[PDB]
Structures are given as C-alpha cells and as structure tokens.
C-alpha cells in the first residue's frame, strides 16, 4: 500500500491525499 | 516536500501536513 509504495518508489500529493480522512 | 522517498515517520509527517484537520490514517500493509 502506500505506506510500502511511497517509501519504495516516490510518492505524490494525489497519493498522500487519498489517505486523509 | 510530497513527491519524493517517503519512508518510516517521513511518509507520517507527510501526511500531517499534507491533510491538515482532517487527519489521516496510516496502515503499514
């Protein structure tokens, strides 16, 4: 997931955005 | 700061900054 995938590869705000409540 | 390596309490600190009051969840798997 993105925790995994935004460390692995680099992440984005479309990505880190999804994860807010 | 967004698009890069976001790893351990980076990705945390983040996510902080990035949602503001809304907050985020942060699920390891």
């Known amino acids: ?3 995994e995938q935004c460390c692995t590869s680099i992440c984005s705000l479309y990505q ?5 409540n | 700061f967004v ?6 309490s980076h990705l ?3 996510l902080y900054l990035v ?3 809304r907050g985020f969840f ?3 798997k």
Do not use: S
């Open chain 2, 12 to 14: 945390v600190e983040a």
């Open chain 2, 26 to 28: 942060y699920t390891p």
């Open chain 1, 16 to 20: 880190l955005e999804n994860y807010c």
């Open chain 2, 19 to 21: 949602c503001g009051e």
């Open chain 1, 1 to 3: 997931g993105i925790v």
């Open chain 2, 3 to 8: 698009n890069q390596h976001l790893c351990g």
